């Protein structure tokens, strides 16, 4: 019943597909969407996205940001700015960038650049935790 | 072993020492374990029998309290 | 279901009036062994076997007792 | 005194000497409490 | 006699303890209502959990009832 | 030393086939069963096995155990076997 | 309440200490998990 | 009369509680083999799962207690399960054994937290962001909480197992008194008893796990 549409500016992972459950890391917490879910629209934060197909297999991607919209007709549109499959990433670079961002944080003093640093820190933390 | 012998001097022939009874109990434990538990494709009966003997041993010492709830009087 | 009776007709049957001689023969054999004291040759395996069939007939006496008092759990009175 | 201290005390040494030390102090406390209880009964 | 009297009193007292099971079932189903209104595709599994919760909550309440009878009839 | 592939052939999970095959020559096949029923009748008749609440708790726990076995016996058995075969295959692949 | 009968208390305390701290831990120490091969 | 199942069992005058307490470990065989029977396979798998679930949160100093805690969660569990057998004596129903399991463990944990770590140990008596006008009371609170912890442990185990067993026994007695009266009512009470037995199996496992988890959380708090 659920028509799923997972997309990126350059790639279409799903299009009108019929899956059973999609977990998303909304900025207001994580939640899972199945058929007939209550209509909502949300914006994402860096995190995993697990798509469960009817056959019982799970496809795990990682999205940096974007939007999710589940509609009255059980039609889900998930548009991610940078959606990468998990195998395209590495743990060492994530940990190193996390350390660099933490160092810049303890070094920085201005509010806006501190917020930018903290955002990068959160992205890298979600990275290292999603990888392993 | 017993089930083969028919002599009462066998009773005195056994080792009725702490090490002797310890070894007899260990031998029985290993015989049971190797016939019923220590086999691949084993069953649950190898444990249910021990649990049954345990329930029996429990009812044993519980009889002294359970004989006061007798239905009849004779 | 029915195989129980299929076996009972063989082994759960009142003894026929023709086979009591063989029974008293087994009894006289056992009492002879008791007289001579030759039961010591009986290895304890068969001795336990005989004790178990003895407890069997004793259980038969007790089920007769409970059917004779018209009560299962002790004496109703 | 053989195969006892070979199978009972050899493996348990690193735990009985360094790990469970405060456990032994607590055991002393528990024994003292149980003795004080069984005393005033 | 004062014995039967206090038996009645303690029976009523132990009976008071069913308010907990009452309030418990309220939350178990109220939250079931909310959870179904959120993700209706999981109605069956939620209803399962619901029963489980209820089956425990009222259980505790029933316990009190036994004590009541344990005081009123067993004593 | 390798392990034997089977156990001891216990009947009803309580009595092994050794007892039945040993009582078989003298008293046939229903001999052990009539021994069991005679014993239980004499026990619950001479007040050896008194009847109380413990009897019904025993019936309940025995029913739960028998249902649990009959339901999740194949699963745990083949799960242990699957663990063993997985370890064995992983080992042989490392050879 | 028999739990309050403080006469038989050591009979409960001692074998528990013998079982939980010596026997069971010795049976655990024999349960070893080797590292996986290459 | 009613508590005849919690009295220290004696057979032929000997304190058979000793054998009942020593028996549980006899159900956990071990083997030096690499591939062994089904029982040891499943039991090693269960010990592995339990160790992973309990010890993961701890640092390198807490994990030294692994052999302890796992052993604990095994012993209690087995005992509790063995308690559900008919006419059995459950040694966890005794306040003595639970106290002797709780006071040593919690006491050693607080002691190892006080020997080293003494500054943070005394600091844990006060949460981080506590305002000033409430500093004093929230010390007297935490002291009494820390002092009641071992009691709470032992009683939470005893009270639970004892009540479970007593209640199963009472519903069994009800079934007995309903045998000679309405038979559908007898069947209903018997079904209630079966559901209660399942609940009691669950509560046995859960109480073992909760005792273990609380001791482990105290250890983590002092390591």
């Amino acid at each position: 019943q659920m028509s799923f549409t997972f997309a990126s500016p350059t790639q279409v992972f799903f299009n009108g597909a019929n899956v059973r459950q999609v977990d998303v890391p909304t900025l207001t917490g994580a939640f899972g969407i199945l058929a007939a879910h209550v209509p909502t629209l949300q914006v994402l934060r860096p995190g995993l996205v697990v798509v469960h197909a009817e056959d019982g297999t799970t496809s795990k991607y990682f999205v940096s940001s974007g939007s999710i919209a589940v509609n009255a007709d059980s039609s889900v549109q998930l548009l991610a700015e940078e959606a990468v499959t998990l195998d395209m990433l590495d743990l060492g670079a994530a940990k190193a960038n996390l350390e660099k961002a933490q160092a810049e944080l303890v070094g920085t003093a201005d509010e806006a650049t501190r917020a930018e640093i903290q955002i990068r820190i959160e992205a890298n933390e979600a990275l290292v935790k999603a990888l392993e | 072993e017993v089930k083969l012998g028919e002599l009462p001097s066998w009773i005195l022939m056994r080792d009725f020492s702490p090490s002797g009874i310890f070894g007899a109990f260990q031998r029985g434990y290993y015989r049971y374990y190797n016939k019923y538990i220590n086999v691949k494709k084993g069953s649950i009966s190898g444990i249910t029998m021990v649990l049954a003997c345990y329930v029996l041993f429990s009812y044993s010492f519980s009889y002294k309290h359970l004989k006061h709830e007798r239905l009849r009087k004779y | 279901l029915a195989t129980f009776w299929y076996y009972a007709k063989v082994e759960l049957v009142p003894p026929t009036p023709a086979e009591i001689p063989r029974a008293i023969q087994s009894l006289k054999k056992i009492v002879n062994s008791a007289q001579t004291g030759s039961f010591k040759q009986l290895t304890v395996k068969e001795a336990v076997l005989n004790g178990l069939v003895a407890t069997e007939v004793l259980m038969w006496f007790y089920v007769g007792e409970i059917i004779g008092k018209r009560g299962i759990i002790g004496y109703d009175v | 005194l053989q195969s006892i201290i070979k199978n009972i005390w050899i493996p348990m040494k690193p735990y009985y000497t360094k790990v469970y030390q405060e456990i032994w102090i607590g055991m002393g406390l528990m024994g003292f409490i149980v003795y004080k209880i069984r005393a005033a009964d | 006699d004062i014995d039967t009297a206090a038996k009645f009193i303690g029976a009523g007292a132990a009976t008071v303890g069913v308010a907990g099971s009452g309030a418990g079932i309220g939350t178990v189903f109220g939250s079931l209502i909310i959870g179904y209104a959120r993700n209706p595709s999981l109605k069956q599994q939620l209803f399962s959990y619901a029963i489980l919760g209820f089956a425990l909550s009222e259980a505790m309440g029933l316990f009190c009832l036994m004590v009541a009878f344990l005081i009123l009839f067993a004593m | 030393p390798p392990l034997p592939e089977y156990g001891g052939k216990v009947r009803y999970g309580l009595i092994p086939e050794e007892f039945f095959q040993f009582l078989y020559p003298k008293t046939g096949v229903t001999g052990p069963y009539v021994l069991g029923t005679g014993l239980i009748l004499y026990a619950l008749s001479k007040e050896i096995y008194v009847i109380s609440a413990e009897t019904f708790t025993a019936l309940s726990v025995l029913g739960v155990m028998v249902y649990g076995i009959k339901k999740y016996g194949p699963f745990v058995a083949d799960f242990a076997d699957k663990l063993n075969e997985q370890k064995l295959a992983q080992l042989e692949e490392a050879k | 309440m028999p739990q309050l009968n403080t006469t038989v208390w050591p009979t409960m305390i001692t074998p528990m200490l013998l079982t939980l701290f010596l026997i069971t831990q010795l049976k655990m120490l024999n349960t070893n998990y080797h590292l996986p091969p290459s | 009369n009613l508590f005849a199942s919690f009295i220290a069992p004696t057979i032929l005058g000997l304190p058979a509680a000793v054998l009942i307490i020593l028996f549980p470990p006899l159900l956990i065989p071990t083997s030096k083999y690499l591939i062994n029977n089904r029982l040891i396979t499943t039991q090693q798998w269960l010990i592995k799962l339990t160790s992973k679930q309990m010890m993961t949160m701890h640092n390198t100093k807490g994990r030294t207690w692994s052999l302890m805690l796992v052993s604990l969660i095994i012993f209690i569990a087995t005992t509790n399960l063995l308690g559900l057998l008919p006419h059995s004596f459950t040694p966890t129903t005794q306040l003595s054994m639970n106290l002797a399991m709780a006071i040593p463990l919690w006491a050693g944990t607080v002691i190892m937290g006080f020997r080293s770590k003494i500054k943070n140990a005394l600091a844990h008596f006060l949460p981080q962001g506590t305002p000033t006008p409430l500093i004093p009371m929230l010390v007297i609170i935490e002291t009494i909480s820390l002092l009641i912890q071992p009691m709470a442990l032992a009683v939470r185990l005893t009270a639970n197992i004892t009540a479970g067993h007593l209640l199963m026994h009472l519903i069994g007695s009800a079934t007995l008194a309903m045998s000679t009266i309405n038979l559908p009512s007898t069947l209903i009470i018997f079904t209630i008893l079966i559901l209660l037995t399942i609940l009691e199996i669950a509560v046995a496992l859960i109480q073992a796990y909760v005792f273990t988890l609380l001791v482990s959380l105290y250890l983590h708090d002092n390591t």
């Binding site: 997309a7 500016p9 629209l41 949300q42 914006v43 939007s67 009255a72 | - | - | - | - | - | - | -």
Partner: protein, 191 residues
């Protein structure tokens, strides 16, 4: 050429972005004054009737909106449209852009344009984007998509059926959809 290949996923993505405003049926407010008008073109000439069409549509819409008294501001994505419109429309102008057309447009460009449109101090109550919807190698059509502000989507009655919705999530979603629609226009105007 290659743009016809990179359009299919981009078309799917942009239309999936807009599918919400299509399903919930947001109608936009017809009573407000502040209007933003983005036109998408390139920096290169010799396209034919592309920049002319964009400029004609922008001029006609500026006329019909100012006739109703709505203060319009213009944004030109591409030097051609800014050059064509700067003389006759200079007061009505906020931001322009360059370096479009030489390289295929990417989402980074759309994000930059969205940034500079938000960091401009011009709270537009409504907006519209005008691009050249590509139909066939011979045929294109100057199309126009709407762009709603936060207060439009928030105060819409048909938006009550949506869940976990507050002003913050709607703000973030609005900004992301602005970027998405700019990207969609950029990928359509390069064909």
């Amino acid at each position: 050429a290659r743009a016809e290949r990179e359009l299919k996923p981009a078309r799917i993505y942009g239309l999936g972005s807009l599918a919400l405003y299509e399903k919930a049926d947001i109608k936009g407010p017809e009573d407000k004054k502040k209007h933003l008008l983005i036109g998408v073109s390139s920096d290169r000439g010799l396209c034919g009737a592309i920049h002319s069409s964009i400029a004609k549509q922008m001029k006609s819409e500026v006329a019909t909106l100012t006739a109703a008294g709505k203060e319009v501001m213009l944004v030109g994505i591409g030097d051609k449209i800014r050059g064509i419109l700067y003389r006759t429309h200079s007061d009505q102008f906020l931001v322009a852009f360059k370096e479009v057309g030489r390289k295929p447009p990417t989402f980074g460009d759309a994000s930059v344009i969205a940034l500079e449109l938000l960091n401009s101090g011009y709270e537009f109550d409504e907006g519209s984007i005008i691009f050249n919807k590509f139909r066939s190698v011979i045929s294109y059509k100057t199309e126009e998509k709407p762009i709603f502000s936060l207060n439009t989507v928030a105060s819409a009655d048909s938006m009550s059926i949506y869940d976990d919705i507050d002003a913050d999530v709607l703000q973030n979603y609005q900004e992301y959809n602005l970027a998405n629609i700019i990207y969609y226009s950029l990928k359509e105007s390069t064909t």
